[PDB]
């Protein structure tokens, strides 16, 4: 693994020392996840410190936990401090290239959120904003307020234009497969989405590749990120 940037938070070698709630630790074990992977060991402390992050990583590296477990922890703290109102949120947004990936990530979020609620946390609310859903479905969930939203870029753009969603309290934005999303034509939509932020945000970008178009994108999207590169082998 290769890490670049100033002020790199030290790596943490176990999930327990990363301070996840017990319900999360129990759920990792139920999923057979016992020890962290290299991008988790270095990436989770980076995200928990509040820094922006570039993860050069692909499926199999354990990237998904890097960008899903911190945002659940942040939302849980926020919901305790001040319960979310109807029409409030999202606080955290994950954008990905495909319906099947968004569904998968959303289900991961709801899994951990269910585990937390079975252990006397509040129930956090997670929205899926993709194609093949009606105005009806989407409007419904956003009516109750949303902690976390998982979206594909064209659908999110539609919702933002129609003022059905607002990014006014969104403080966390993760881009999963940013290379794939730009190759598929969504650069403009993603860049436009960033301009819907009225205030500051922590931005995470995950990509298996890093060609010049993506290097330039990341320069525009992120601020002083820590880069973590798992390597072509790992």
Numbering used by the authors: 169 to 402
Describing publication, verbatim:
In contrast, DEAD box protein 41 (DDX41), a member of the helicase superfamily 2 (SF2), is unique in that it can recognize two different types of ligands, double-stranded DNA (dsDNA) and CDN45. DDX41 consists of two RecA-like domains (i.e., DEAD and HELICc domains), which are conserved among DEAD box proteins. These domains have several conserved motifs, such as the Q motif and motif I, which are both essential for ATP binding by the DEAD box proteins. In this work, we determined two different crystal structures of the DDX41 DEAD domain in apo forms.
We determined the apo-form structures of two constructs, residues 169–402 (DEAD402) and 169–399 (DEAD399), at 1.5 and 2.2 Å resolutions, respectively. In the crystal structure of DEAD402, helix α2 and the Q motif are located adjacent to helix α3 and motif I, and the N-terminal residues (169–173) form a β strand (β1) and participate in the core β-sheet formation. We hereafter refer to this conformation of the N-terminal region as the “closed” form. The closed form of the DDX41 DEAD domain superimposes well on that of DDX3, with an RMSD of 1.56 Å over 215 Cα atoms. Especially, this superimposition revealed that the structure around the ATP-binding site, including the Q motif and motif I, adopts a similar conformation to that of DDX3. Interestingly, a malic acid molecule from the crystallization solution is present at this putative binding site for the ATP phosphate group in the closed form structure. One of the two carboxylate groups of the malic acid interacts with the main chain amide groups of motif I, while the other carboxylate group forms a salt bridge with the Arg residues in the adjacent molecule in the crystalline lattice. This observation is consistent with the fact that the crystals of the closed form were obtained only under conditions containing malic acid. Thus, in the present crystal structure, the DDX41 DEAD domain is trapped in the closed form by the carboxylate group of malic acid, which is bound by mimicking the phosphate group. Consequently, the structure of the ATP-binding site is completely rearranged in these open forms, and thus they do not seem to be able to bind ATP. Therefore, these results suggested that the closed form represents the ATP-bound state of DDX41, while both open forms 1 and 2 represent its nucleotide-free state.
